[PDB]
């Protein structure tokens with residue numbers, strides 16, 4: 795059971811351009827609130843800054859990354875999000891998109 799998003803890396807702050815139905819249903823946010831925005835709006839007080847930094851660095855370097863994140867739904871309730879980000883390059887080496895699989899691992 796997982797969800798999927800696509801971020802545009804040709805815009806400087808990796809906005810989300812596509813989300814699976816599960817992503818909206820899991821987070822409680824609609825397309826009007828999700829599309830065109832950076833995924834970080836799902837972070838909040840308890841989100842570990844040291845893991846957040848791991849994703850920031852991997853995205854800046856165009857590498858894949860996998861981190862465990864405390865995230866929050868629109869109603870404020872938290873959940874554990876095993877997040878894996880994969881860079882999608884054009885044949886000329888440049889990163890065009892990032893894709894993400896998000897798993898609620900609260901169990």
Ligand SMILES: *[C@@]12=NC3=[C]C([C])=C([C])[C]=C3N([C][C]([O])[C]([O])[C]([O])[C]OP([O])([O])=O)C1=NC(=O)[N]C2=O
Pocket residue numbers: 799800801808832833834835836837846847849850853863865875877879880892893894896
């Ligand atoms: C988010 N999923 C997610 C999916 C993709 C494809 C990408 C590129 C990023 C995310 N993020 C995080 C956010 O966009 C950003 O990369 C990090 O917050 C670190 O950068 P900053 O500048 O903020 O330090 C996701 N973040 C979440 O919290 N939940 C996800 O599902």
